[PDB]
Every structure is written in C-alpha cells, then in structure tokens.
Amino acid sequence: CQDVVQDVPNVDVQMLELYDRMSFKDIDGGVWKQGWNIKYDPLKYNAHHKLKVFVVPHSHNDPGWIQTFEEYYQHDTKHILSNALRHLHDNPEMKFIWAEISYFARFYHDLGENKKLQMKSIVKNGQLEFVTGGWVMPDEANSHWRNVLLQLTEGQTWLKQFMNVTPTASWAIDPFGHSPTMPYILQKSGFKNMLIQRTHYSVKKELAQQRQLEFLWRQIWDNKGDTALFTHMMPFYSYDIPHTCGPDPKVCCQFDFKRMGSFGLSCPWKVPPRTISDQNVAARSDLLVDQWKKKAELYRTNVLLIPLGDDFRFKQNTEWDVQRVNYERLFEHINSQAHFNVQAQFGTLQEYFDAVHQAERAGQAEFPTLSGDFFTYADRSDNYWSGYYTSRPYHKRMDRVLMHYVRAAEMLSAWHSWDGMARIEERLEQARRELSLFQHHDGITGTAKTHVVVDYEQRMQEALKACQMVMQQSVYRLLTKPSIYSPDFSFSYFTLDDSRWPGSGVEDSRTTIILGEDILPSKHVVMHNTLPHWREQLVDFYVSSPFVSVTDLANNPVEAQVSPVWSWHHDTLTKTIHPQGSTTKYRIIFKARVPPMGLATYVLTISDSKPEHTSYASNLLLRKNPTSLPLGQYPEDVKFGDPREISLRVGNGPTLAFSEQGLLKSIQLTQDSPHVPVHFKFLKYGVRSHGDRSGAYLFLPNGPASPVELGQPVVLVTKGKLESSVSVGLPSVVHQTIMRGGAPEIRNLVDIGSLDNTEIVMRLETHIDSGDIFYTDLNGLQFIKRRRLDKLPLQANYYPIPSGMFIEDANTRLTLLTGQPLGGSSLASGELEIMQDRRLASDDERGLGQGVLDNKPVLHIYRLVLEKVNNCVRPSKLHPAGYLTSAAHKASQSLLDPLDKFIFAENEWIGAQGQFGGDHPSAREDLDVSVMRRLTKSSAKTQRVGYVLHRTNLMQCGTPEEHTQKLDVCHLLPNVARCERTTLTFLQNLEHLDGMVAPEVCPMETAAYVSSHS
C-alpha cells in the first residue's frame, strides 16, 4: 500500500501552490475578455502536419431547473431525442453525444420496438455516443461520493442492459466548479478520459498560457500516480457556441446557425450568422479556421475539440438541418483548400480523445500531471459561486438522510433472495433513481425554481417511504423464526423512528409507543447497524409513560434515562421563544449495542412506578419572568433561575462551559486539563445595495458578518446520567448542545422566517494558531488543505463543507463534522464558520429568474471534536491533504450512518429473535462496506451480491487500539462459488480471486467485489 501521509507527490501543477502564486487580476484581454490576443504561426500546420478538427454536436438537458424533469421531457427532451434519432438515421456522417441517462431511459422505454432497434443501430455504429452515462451530470461540490457513484451506476447499468455500451469518457460541462472525487470514481469505473468546463477564469488563463489545459489528474495524496485520469479543461467562458469555436465570441456566434432570427435567437455581439453559400464560403472559412487555429494554440496536439451545442438544443428538425447543412458546406470547402491544412468533421467525444492519445503515442506531446480541486469557481469579476454551497439547506440535509436510507434498505434486503411479489427490486430501483436524480447540478445545489424544488422533495419523500417498506420487511424476515414467518408484503410490521429527520420542530412525525395497563404492557424495538463493526449508540423513543424500563431479549435489564419531550414555540403574544413540555409523552434513552451489519432487539415495558434501572433527568429553565412548566407524571419538577453561566459533564467525557446566553464558551477534555476557549456565535451577512446581488448561485456579501442581536434568550438545561443538553431559543435558531460522554452533538433548528436578504452563519472562535490554513472535505471522501487568501474577496474563501472541516496548530485541533453539506470558511486564525441558511429577494442573473424565498425550518446536525494533536503523525507542511483522527471519523459516521430504529407495529411479535449478525466480522475502524447490493433477481440460478469497500486513512496518534477481524465480504453469504473484483459500478470483472477471498483495501482506496452463490 502507498503511504498517503508521508510522501508529498511531485506534480507539475498543484492547485493550492498555484493559488498561492497567482495574482488573479481581472484585466480586459480583448475579444477573449479573460485571456489575451492569441497569435499563431501560419506555418505550423502544412501538408505533412494538418490540424484535425472534431466538431461535436451536443444538447445540455437539465433533469429539472426552470421546469421539472417531466415538464422538460414533454416540452423539449422527447422532441430532441426523437429528432436526433431521425436525423442521425438519415445522415450517416452526422454525430451527437448524450449525457443524461435519466432522460434517455424515459425516452427509450416509450419507443416502439422498430424505433428501439433504429436507436440501438445508431449507437452501435458510433453516430450517437453516450458520454459519462450517469443518471445525471452531478453537482461536484455538495454531493457525497457514495451518491455520485450511485447515480453513475444507475445510468451505466441501464446502458449496459439496453444499449450494450459502457462509456469510458466523461463530459461535465455545467457543474459549478470541479472535484477530484470525479476522476477518483471514474478511474475506478473503467474510464480513460474526462472533460470539465467551469473553472475560475484566472485558472483558465494561467493554464492556457502554459498549455496545461490537458493534464493527468491524480489525487492529492497519490505519490505514484496510479489514480491519474487524463482530463481536458475547456478554455473559455462557456460551453455555448459563441465560446467554443475560438477566442472571439463575436465571430463564433456567426457559426451558431440557430441565431439568424426565425428561432427567436440572436447574437449579443450584433453580427448575425449568415447562410453558407458558394459566394461567401471562402471568407466564412477564413474566419472560422482562424478561430480554430487560435484555440489550437492553447493545446499540445494537432487534434482540436470543437463542441457544437447549448441548453436543450437540437429540438426542431429545421435546427438539425440548419446546423448540419451549413457545417457540411464549410467542411467541404476547408478540407479541399490545401492552404488551410485542416481536416474537419463531425465527431464524438471518444473520437477526439482517441486521436489525442494517438498523437501522444506518436511522441508529439507529453502531458503535465496535476493534483488539487477547482473550487471556488468564479465566472467573471468577483462573482464567486459559493452561495449554492448552502442554498435550499432543507433538501441538502434530506439528501444525506436518503443517502443512508438507500444504503440501509439495499443492505438489509440483500441478505435474502425475494419473491417478485414482495416488490423489493421495484422499490429499491425507485429509491435509487430519485436519490440519483437529486444529484443533478440544479438539485442538491439549491439552484432550481421553487416548484422544481417541490418536485425533488416529493420524489425523495416517496423514495424514503420505499426504503422504509423494504427495510421493515427485511427486519421482520431476519428476526422471525423461519417456520413461523408469514409475510404480507403490503403490511407494515415495523415503522421507522428517526429522531433527526425531519426533526423536532420541523414535523411531528414520530410515533409515540403507547403502553398502559389497560392496553399494552410492552413493545419490541429493533436497531440496525449498517457499519461493519460492533457499535454502541444511545437511542431514544417517545413513550406514553415515564415509568418504562428496557431489557434485551435475554431479559437482562438495560440502564435507561427518561427526559421530557420539549418543543419550542415562538410566542406571538409574549414575543419570546420558549419551550413547552408534554404532559403525556416522554423520551426514553438507552444504549443499544448492535452487531456489525446487524440487528439487535430490545423490549420497553411499563410499570406502575419508577423502575429500578431507569433514571430521570433534571430540567432547569433560565429566563427572567418564568412561568410554571408542569410535566404530568414525570417525577422531577422543573427548576427555574435567572440566566447564568453553567457547566456540564456527562460520564468521564469533556466538561463544557456555557455563557448565560446558552452558547458554548469552553471545553475541558479531562479533570486536570485547561478550559480551552471554544465559543459559538451566530452572525448575519447582508446583500449589496448596488452592483451585483447574491442569489441562489452567488454569495456577494456587503462586508464581514455582523453579530445577531440575541436579547436575553431563554435557555433550557437538561441534566441526565446518560445524556445532558443546553438549548437556547435565539432569533432564527433553536441551538442545542448535547452531551453523551464524548464529543458533543450540536443541533440547530433553523427558521430564517421572513428575514429578507440575510444569510445566517454559525461561527466558532478559538485561540488555535491556525493562521491562514484550514481543511475542508471533498464529497465526504477526503480532506483538502485550504489557504485563506486576502488577495481574494470574502466569498472566494468560502468552500463546500460536504461533511466536515477543521483547523489546527502544532498542539490542538478543532473539527466540526456535519450531517448536511453547507458552505463555510476560516476567515481568521482560530475560526471556523458554516452557513446555516440564506434568504435572498434578488435574482443573481444567471437565468434562474428568482431569489431564494422558499425557506423552511431545517434541523442541521453536527459533532464538535476538540483534540490534542501534538503526538499525531501528520503530513509535512507541503502536503496538500489532511486526515481525521479516529474520534472525528467515528463522529462523522454517527451523523451520516446512525443506527436505524424500528418499532414493532402490532401487539405481539410471534417468533421474535434477539439478534442478527452476531457472527459477522467486526472490521478495523477505518474500513466501511459502503454498498452491499444483491445484483440478481430470485429466478437466477447463480445469485450475485456486490460490495463496495472503502478504507479511509486515520491519523496515528499513539493509541494501540487493535484486535479486529479480517473482513472478507465474499464469505458473508453462504455457498460462495466465485469471488471477483469488479469496477465500482459492478459492470466489468477485473480479477478472479483465489480462494474466493476478497482482500481488504489500502488506505484511501475503494474496491468493488461481487460474490456468486449456488
């Protein structure tokens, strides 16, 4: 295994180093506004060395943006595909590339058989070529790598099954900035090439000057280069026709033949295209070839890529004709005039890359190596696209909930083969497809119109219901005596109980377990642990009595704590935000211990008085002018006091101190250690009163944030043996700090209400001597070093925080893990900040045509880990990566993949069993079974199960922590007959494994294996 910590890779271009050296000046470069006047030597190409030009027709089809997926499909995409089929069928030399499989599958299944056969023929002959082949073209900033892989697999599995092709070239022309997680996943999925477009205009200029727009993109920790994927970065401001033929859009726009008038389009530069004729073809070719030769100067080979397309293009038959006939006249002239020394033709993306690599092998070019990312993108001036790291945060959080539910449903149901009548495959396909659709670069990014966001939310809600159905049928089958099991595949044997989604104060969706002497004495509950190691975690349920005790199925008592059910209310009469307690529902909390990828059953039983093994939390309300807070049968009366500082400690864990406003002020790790200043603060950013305004994409603050005026907020302190907390009702946020013995959990119920033109930020202030350095993650996969640059505006220093961020000095580190992707930064030494929500009345002029005014309450969740790191073996100062400690990685897993909780629905569960998975191996902590998916239906004689195994890399800090079992996923199911290593999409077998044993992977690697069973 390669060492991912101690060896700094030697690359030609390292993006953090490039950023440190670049000046980012925005000067007027002439017709190429953000470049320079390109010059070329006319003698460079001659009869023995011609410029080969591939014009690649395309149509960018968003699966939701200004219209819903179905609306665009009916109004636009179905016509584009039907006419592409007809025009390619009838014109053998015409070509077209297609990226979004969600639309293609929707179209293909509606075609008659004669047309399905015509479509398969134009794909098999190479006229229509799929690029990437994912369900969507995903966002690369907020997406979790597990969902990027999920959507890639959904689209490619469909293509292999119906079109018999697997793309090896990727096309990503619209995500707003680009992540190295893409080449990481693509290279492990059989790809050989990829293309990107939205990178900072200063980066395009810098790389163009050095002819470094094509590069071998490797991961930041990869010393050897085996993760490298050839990447082509487009050079210009857009992928539309005016910015793809060459540097001068006023000239290129004249070669978009849809802009002469009858289609309702025109050229902003005021010179229209003209139909090509024998009288103008020489002057028109002179102009076009000059643009091509200028573009070719920015690259190293004699093969030039010329995309020809725009959003929802190629819809009308007349549009196909006008583009094709005019380009054919140009090619016939250009290719016959030896003096141009050009051979131009329609082509596909793969044809371009194959020709580039033929040139490379002929020794005509060598390509530079590059590591790093391409965030934060700016398309012009100071317009940095960091707003969408936070826009529509409710749905960003929903993405992570559904991510976990899909994994848990696929894993729980993979253990058995299911009859078709159980509809398991049907429900899982629906859930995977709705989550995959939301990875679109207008889905999770929060950049779609309001009604489109509602469509994505409804789709995801249906997907969550599908996952619940599959999970609960699976639990019932895994935990019921086989000869007793009698399933009704439409019945709900269990209901899921989720304490954090939609969350307290967001939706009263949780069921109360109703017990009573005259109705039901007890209830079975079951916990599932999708992680491959034994895990303990506190779990809570709502119950109708405070006198409840817990037992495991061997009837051993389990220690429990009962606390009240507190809800917060914005009291419009008293104008205060304060909590109300229930007098008939209570929370019971206990530690569940669950096997690796397993299930554990417990029983909750009511008694007439306080149970021996259940304790009760105390509650203290701090506010002036208190009023009584009765709690029914709860045995401890609520206490009251004036606001004051307070301190809490659960177990042997840290001691936390809070201000009189209920906000953390310090953390003391152990009895003797110092009280380290760690202060939470809420602030607000506004919008500019002149110039460009913030919107769904752009963050254009009117200066540094201002503290939110807090008044004298109401603070609620609950102190328990198993769990304590401090909650405060601030304007726009009920902020909670929860302690269970280790790093605290933070929950914010964020309701920005009607605060227009406001972005609310949560900041941590410490005295850690971080300087200008901080770390943020990329797609939940890796942590990358960031350097704050005062030569760039505030919004340029914001980066995606898809799952965590940290600051550190020689001795101390503070890591904030998230349960949802949000934007954040470290704007001063010792600080971390993360945006909670943003409400914007203005549009940011990118085409969305609305502000962001559809905010709704969202429960954001986090873990806050303060640690001593002086003994940790960390990368050197020049390494571009950072790594989590064991505690921080486990805290991230507690947010993203918590235990699942099931409540038995009926009164009695006959044949109930106490555990599943007790014999499953408990794998080393850095290893995860990211995906477990049965790949065959029940009619297959040979069953196949696919696993994606990911190993992260955790810092060595002196903890022996060992004794674990080797995990061989190929032997998790019985009767294994074969084990194969495959691409991550499971679509190609790469190695037949000896002994049917799937080896574990190296740190930072991901592998896939498929086991076959007789």
Ligand SMILES: CS[C@H]1[C@H](O)[C@H](O)[C@H](O)[C@@H]1NCc1ccccc1
């Ligand atoms: C506003 S940017 C982007 C949206 O968020 C959608 O994804 C849409 O495809 C659009 N493309 C880029 C584009 C815009 C205008 C003209 C040509 C291309």
Ligand SMILES: *[C@@H]1O[C@H](CO)[C@@H](O)[C@H](O)[C@H]1NC(C)=O
């Ligand atoms: C699928 O493509 C392969 C490669 O061209 C070809 O050999 C095969 O016949 C095609 N159809 C089948 C058999 O799946």
Ligand SMILES: [Zn+2]
């Ligand atoms: Zn788009």
